[PDB]
Amino acid sequence: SEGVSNLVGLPNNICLQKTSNQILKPKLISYTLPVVGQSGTCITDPLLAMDEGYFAYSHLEKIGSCSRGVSKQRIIGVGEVLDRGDEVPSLFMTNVWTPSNPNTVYHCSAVYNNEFYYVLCAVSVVGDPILNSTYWSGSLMMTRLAVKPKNNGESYNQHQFALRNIEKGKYDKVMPYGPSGIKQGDTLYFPAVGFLVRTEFKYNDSNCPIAECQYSKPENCRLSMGIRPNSHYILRSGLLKYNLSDEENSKIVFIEISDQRLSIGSPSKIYDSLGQPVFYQASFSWDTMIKFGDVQTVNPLVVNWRDNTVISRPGQSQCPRFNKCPEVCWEGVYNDAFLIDRINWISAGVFLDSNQTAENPVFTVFKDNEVLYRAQLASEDTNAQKTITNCFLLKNKIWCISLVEIYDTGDNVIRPKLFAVKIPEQCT
Amino acid sequence: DIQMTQSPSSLSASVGDRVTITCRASQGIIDYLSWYQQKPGKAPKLLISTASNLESGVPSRFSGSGSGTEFTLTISSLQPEDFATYSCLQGYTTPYTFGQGTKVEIKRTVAAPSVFIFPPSDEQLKSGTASVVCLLNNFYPREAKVQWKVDNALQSGNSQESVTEQDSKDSTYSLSSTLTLSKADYEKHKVYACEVTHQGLSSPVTKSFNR
Amino acid sequence: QVQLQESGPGVVKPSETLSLTCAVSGGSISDTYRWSWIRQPPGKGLEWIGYIYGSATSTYYNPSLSSRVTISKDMSKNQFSLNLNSVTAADTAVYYCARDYQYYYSGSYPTPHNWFDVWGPGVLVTVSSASTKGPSVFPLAPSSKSTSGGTAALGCLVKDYFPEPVTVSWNSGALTSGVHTFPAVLQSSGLYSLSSVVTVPSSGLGTQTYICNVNHKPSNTKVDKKVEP
Ligand SMILES: *[C@@H]1O[C@H](CO[C@@H]2O[C@@H](C)[C@@H](O)[C@@H](O)[C@@H]2O)[C@@H](O[C@@H]2O[C@H](CO)[C@@H](O[C@@H]3O[C@H](CO)[C@@H](O)[C@H](O[C@H]4O[C@H](CO)[C@@H](O)[C@H](O)[C@@H]4O)[C@@H]3O)[C@H](O)[C@H]2NC(C)=O)[C@H](O)[C@H]1NC(C)=O
Ligand SMILES: *[C@@H]1O[C@H](CO[C@@H]2O[C@@H](C)[C@@H](O)[C@@H](O)[C@@H]2O)[C@@H](O[C@@H]2O[C@H](CO)[C@@H](O[C@@H]3O[C@H](CO)[C@@H](O)[C@H](O)[C@@H]3O)[C@H](O)[C@H]2NC(C)=O)[C@H](O)[C@H]1NC(C)=O
Ligand SMILES: *[C@@H]1O[C@H](CO)[C@@H](O[C@@H]2O[C@H](CO)[C@@H](O[C@@H]3O[C@H](CO)[C@@H](O)[C@H](O)[C@@H]3O)[C@H](O)[C@H]2NC(C)=O)[C@H](O)[C@H]1NC(C)=O
Ligand SMILES: *[C@@H]1O[C@H](CO)[C@@H](O)[C@H](O)[C@H]1NC(C)=O
């Protein structure tokens, strides 16, 4: 055995009962992927993607403080997900690529297809494209890493494509902006975002939902559609589509998201669960409550957002946790969820249990209006920021792996941590 | 809000010393501490942002460190210029919070106050009261308490002090004493003196003789 | 070069509403994200009152004051205002206009580091039922008693003014060496008692001319008093 499969079919029963018992028992599993191990350098900008018993990983290592440090290394790797022997899954890396200049690579994203990962990624000499947006050249790079490297074989193991032809429509720029994507047949879909000049953004403020929000003004979401109300651009999430069956390697197409539940363009994720794609979008604006759901159509993109009333994200100012009313802000965090059962929608993710600060990461199995069960991944006072969760099967048992950026209690340096959590069957 | 307990509230070190002010946070603010310096009758100046980053144009002797809950600002070599109340700003969650501030003073040696007496104003006498003034000037320490032997009657509480800050060139204080009597009280004694107590060990006494 | 300036009454009656207005010169309010008002009570730590969005209607207030505080803006003038109702004597303080700076490192990490990069000079507001009153200025005339033979000290006694805020300058700013203006402590009448002295060479008396140049903002006063042996 020792083989990891995607969640498909009727997995072994999980606990469907809301409980307080400490039935979730996480495993720290980051020791077989030793890339993370470090002593005080800051590791940031994490990427974990899993598909079909393989995975993609990435981080950026900066010398100095996590916020003003200097980029030292960019690592983009791929490997296999296997049972280490005790019926616990763990990541083992097979192929690593180090970009020549770390200061050019931003906002990578990964999609698996037929024994390769493709990591679409943004190239910028002006800085972070989101922060210095009007000057970003707009260029994109496509790396392709083989999950099964072959000895003395080049252009199979690693291959770089320059995307000359970008179909952007009305947008000036498009960009990978999310960890994970899906494959459908021969075509790859990356979570992406588009930069649209605000004065070309057609919106009626009569469409802003100010119901039960006395203190909210109708322009608010029209304004909060960019990082500042002034912003030359607004951001709109969607997908970057890449058809491998296309003759040339140049063309990549943008697909915008529906105007349902529109929220500022956010780090997003499209993934496969139990037979359909589910789409998640981070909340960086007034709609703090989690937004993710089944994908009715990938192109055009329309997402059946769950009316979740229990899961949210922290926010320091003007958009704290549990805010459902339109306001101008650009704050939040990427804590995604991954569906485990669709018959009853039960999903798993690591969320920060705080109103304002980014502390107390908690692994949480929940339905729309209720949280079935929790397990705290660190002390309640522990500061952590971003969580990426993916779930799969191991001997038909549902397992998740969550990457959690966690801060040292004494150092203030942050490092990614890898937890494996088995969803139990029994509620005792 | 997140409370910032700053300490020590006051401090005094010689030039060329290392000063350390520290500041703790109710919760964890990872890297979100700003260190400010404010000088009398001026706006605050930002010295350190994001816990450890000197802002451009700020001397290298200022340095900052943090653990998430404890944050320490260090002035490596105190200079006369660096005398100010220094403060914390947690810039993470709103309401933003400031430390209570700490007053860095400078120690100095061998300063002797030059004492001056100012007789009542002739324009003030027509008004009603008389405010005899004495001036202690460019001296460390600040304590040069003034005793007025009004004539030869000892006076307590018929006079109040007013003491300047620490000067940024020579690190000396000044102190002004103002004795308010009435006009009628002023005329009869016709004898007024301010005595000074300082580290001069001469008990110097300056006199004034009405008209 | 962007700069702020506070304008306000200096004294507010107890139990009535305080108001202040900041004028922004050197740039438009619509260029910066958030602007804020913060205050410092005397002998006490800085407090943050709240912010207004630069180009949006949004406001956030410190919950110690949220019930009483209203922060408004006038874009046509580049002004923004503070209104703090039902003032207690606990609200005596120096009030600072200020603007906010946000540092970001990654566009997939919207957690700005906040602080304040530009400040006003600050305005003191006193919360007292008393009634304003301008100063009188009398020459602390130099004498043999105030002359050391190489240094002579002369001054101005500023008296009977409410409230405390006043400005002084020797020869209208040109004389700044050996000048010392003392911190007014509460005078027994309740008005404010400070002295203002300067040390000058004792052989330059009579030949040179010195002027007090006192100013009282709450009751408009521009004294130009002179001192002579
Ligand atoms: C973290 O934040 C949550 C909720 O987020 C915030 O909730 C609001 C208070 C507001 O700040 C929002 O903008 C923001 O998103 C806090 O949990 C909330 O706590 C409050 C007060 O404890 C609750 O309000 C109460 O709700 C009861 C029903 O659930 C209701 O019966 C109560 O009414 C009683 O009191 C009111 C006066 O307050 C009175 O009018 C009534 O007559 C009655 O006596 C009261 O309204 C919210 O429901 C809570 N919301 C949630 C989602 O749990 C949480 O406290 C905060 N954490 C910290 C540490 O501050
Ligand atoms: C991804 O791209 C593939 C291939 O597209 C190819 O790209 C060019 C470089 C050309 O050289 C062409 O060979 C081709 O367009 C798409 O697969 C193609 O899809 C089209 C439309 O679905 C198919 O057209 C069919 O035509 C036959 C005619 O006999 C009809 O019977 C069919 O009903 C249909 O109309 C075409 O056959 C197919 N080509 C191959 C090789 O499979 C694919 O659609 C695209 N995917 C996405 C998501 O865009
Ligand atoms: C956003 O990215 C663009 C990319 O070019 C930046 O434009 C240029 O950036 C430089 C450095 O920031 C500006 O300053 C110049 O620097 C050199 C020294 O490196 C100096 O000698 C020159 O005199 C000049 O000052 C340059 O003026 C600027 N050009 C323009 C047209 O803006 C831009 O600064 C970036 N902005 C932000 C906010 O990130
Ligand atoms: C706004 O309303 C007008 C009036 O019917 C309509 O023509 C326009 O398409 C609307 N715009 C959007 C974005 O809904």
Author numbering:
A (entry chain A): 175 to 602
B (entry chain F): 1 to 211
C (entry chain E): 1 to 229
Q: What did the published study say regarding this structure?
A:
The Nipah (NiV) and Hendra (HeV) viruses are nonsegmented single-stranded RNA viruses belonging to the genus Henipavirus of the Paramyxoviridae family. HNV cell entry is a complex multistep process involving the binding of G to host receptors, the activation and structural rearrangement of F, membrane fusion, and the release of the viral genome. Because of their critical role in viral invasion, G and F are major targets for developing therapeutic monoclonal antibodies (mAbs). Here, we isolate a panel of Macaca-derived G-specific antibodies that cross-neutralize HNVs via multiple mechanisms.
To understand the structural basis of the most potent bnAb from the panel, we determined the crystal structure of the 1E5 Fab in complex with the NiVBD GHD at 3.24 Å resolution. 1E5 binds to the central cavity of the G head at an angle nearly perpendicular to the plane formed by the six blades of the β-propeller. The high shape complementarity between the CDRs of 1E5 and the central cavity region of the GHD facilitates extensive residue contacts between them. There are thirty-one residues from CDRH1-3 or CDRL1-3 and two additional residues from FR-L3 involved in the interaction with the 28 residues around the central cavity of G to form 18 hydrogen bonds (H-bonds) at the contact interface, providing the basis for the high affinity of 1E5. Remarkably, the long, protruding CDRH3 of 1E5 is deeply inserted into the central cavity and contributes half of the H-bonds at the 1E5-G interface. Although the epitopes of both RBD-targeting antibodies highly overlap with those of EB2 and their CDRH3s act in a way similar to the G-H loop of EB245, there are still some differences in the details of the binding modes. Compared to 102.3, 1E5 has almost the same binding orientation as EB2, a larger EB2 epitope coverage area, and a deeper insertion depth of CDRH3 to the central cavity. Analysis of 1E5 epitope conservation between NiV and HeV G revealed that residues buried by 1E5 are strictly conserved. Residues W504, E579, T507, G506, Y458, and L305 around the central cavity were identified as the key sites for 1E5 binding. In this case, glycosylation of N306 and N529 should not interfere with the binding of 1E5. In summary, as a receptor-like antibody, the 1E5 epitope is strictly conserved on HNV G proteins and highly overlaps with receptor-binding sites, laying the foundation for its broad neutralization of HNVs.
